Amino acid sequence: QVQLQESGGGLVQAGGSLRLSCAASGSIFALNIMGWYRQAPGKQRELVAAIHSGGTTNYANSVKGRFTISRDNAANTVYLQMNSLKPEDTAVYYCNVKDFGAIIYDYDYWGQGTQVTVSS
Amino acid sequence: KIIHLTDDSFDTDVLKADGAILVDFWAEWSGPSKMIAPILDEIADEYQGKLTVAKLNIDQNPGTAPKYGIRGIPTLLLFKNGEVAATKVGALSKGQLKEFLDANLAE
Amino acid sequence: AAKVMSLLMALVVLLIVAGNVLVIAAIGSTQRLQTLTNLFITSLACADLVVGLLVVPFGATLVVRGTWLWGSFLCELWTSLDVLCVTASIETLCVIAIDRYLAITSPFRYQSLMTRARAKVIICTVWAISALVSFLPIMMHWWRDEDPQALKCYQDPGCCDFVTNRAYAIASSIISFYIPLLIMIFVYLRVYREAKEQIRKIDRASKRKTSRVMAMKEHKALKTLGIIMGVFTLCWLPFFLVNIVNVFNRDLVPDWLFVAFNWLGYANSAMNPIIYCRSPDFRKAFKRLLA
Ligand SMILES: CCCCCCCCCC(=O)N(CCO)C[C@@H](O)[C@@H](O)[C@@H](O)[C@@H](O)CO
Ligand SMILES: CC(C)(C)NC[C@H](O)c1ccc(O)c(CO)c1
Ligand code: NA
Prior knowledge:
The complex is a heterotrimer of chains A (120), B (107) and C (291).
Chain A (H helix, E strand, L loop, with lengths): L2 E5 L2 E4 L3 E9 L6 E8 L6 E7 L4 E3 L7 E5 L5 E7 L7 E9 L7 E4 L3 E6 L1
Parallel strand pairs in A: 2-11
Antiparallel strand pairs in A: 1-3, 3-8, 4-5, 4-9, 5-6, 7-8, 9-10, 9-11
Chain B lengths: L2 E2 L5 H6 L4 E7 L4 H5 L1 H10 L5 E6 L7 H4 L6 E6 L3 E6 L4 H12 L2
Chain C lengths: L1 H27 L8 H28 L6 H35 L1 H7 L2 H24 L8 H8 L10 H40 L10 H31 L8 H22 L3 H10 L2
Helix pairs in contact in C: 1-2, 1-9, 1-10, 2-3, 2-9, 3-4, 3-5, 3-7, 5-7, 7-8, 8-9
Bound molecules: hega-10, salbutamol and sodium ion.
Function (chain B): Participates in various redox reactions through the reversible oxidation of its active center dithiol to a disulfide and catalyzes dithiol-disulfide exchange reactions.
Keywords (chain B): Acetylation, Disulfide bond, Electron transport, Host-virus interaction, Redox-active center, Transport
GO biological process, one term (chain B): cell redox homeostasis
């Protein structure tokens, strides 16, 4: 069974820093996207950052330049280094794996979520 | 179970005859014409009711074979209500012949 | 045999129409299924549906009766409709291969590059090409051989053999089948190649700690890739080989076999729903659509 284990979140002062990490245990097809989404209170879930198995990345505008996503070359583990945090960034952050092993369609795996709260 | 045809009995035994008739045009000289003889014996038992095996010796009765345009031997002419429905030419195994008969008989 | 041959054709049409109706239904009736890829699937399913409704049935009769009962005009229109729908089907499989290859290997580039309006042009292009290889030649008689025996079947309204000249059978085969088959090989090969090179970068990462092996996901992806290329190739390669053979030594291959292989190709149109619509979202829609 595939499972996504989220860590690194919590409480932090504005202008500070956090480093999320999501360790995907289980069979994942070599070609995939590991990503981070978030959902601020009473809003819709949005993309924060994502990285293909290839090495290509894709960020939201809100976080561009501040946050940087990377992955462990060995294991299926993805890190979001969040610098210059603002109260706006406060949300439940969800790890995501888009698996391409069916070819015609993609399969989705979501993490349970991990709270990030940035106070001013 | 096999009808052993002549030139004269051919009209009554094959053209007037009820249901399917499988005619073997064989000769005593031809080695290929004999190789199917023991296979046709088995087919006459195994396809009782469905088909009637018939044989005509071209050494004995040379007058029948020209009419249907028989070039080589053995040639197996399957007959249905006074007409040739399907044809096969050359020697065969039992399994090759069953597929020909299976396909042709069940319409 | 001719008892069972006729019953077999019936369910072929049943499987095609059912399957492709079920797909088109599912896509039109579900917000979640209206993705970019499934836009190309919708094109495919339309082609295969017209194969099931009009192309195969009229063709089924020509085998049963042994003659064409609907006169020279409908012979040529049905022939066009056949070539059109086969060309659209196969060329659309080829577009799907490309699409999936991009969305698997360059997903972020692909999202910006491939808009919905760009997809529509690609789709419309495919049908324009399909029309211009079928309807334009066939209705305008560009396909016709100069032979006397060929000219007998053109004048007989009971005869609806598809005897073409050299040029058309070469061009029509290349455009409807061979170019698409090459693209589909090239493209799906670069999916295999990309996935293998990616596993190399994972073993290089380990500093000689692990060597990776094909897991559940990798065997399943290879099976899928095989089904896609296998079924398509099985279904259409025999017919399209033989179609090029007849352009040289027409006596070599029998007419009953030439037709038998054209039926194998029609059968692909029943297979495509099964191959290309297995997504969890399709599975949900299909159960909702069957009350
Ligand atoms: C929107 C994209 C529009 C592109 C339209 C061009 C279609 C490709 C050209 C073409 O149709 N053919 C290749 C040209 O040979 C095939 C046949 O038209 C032609 O081969 C036959 O007419 C002759 O073989 C018979 O005399
Ligand atoms: C012969 C018949 C029944 C009209 N089928 C044609 C066949 O499906 C076909 C389809 C597309 C093609 O490009 C060709 C080759 O001219 C043939
Ligand atoms: Na005609």
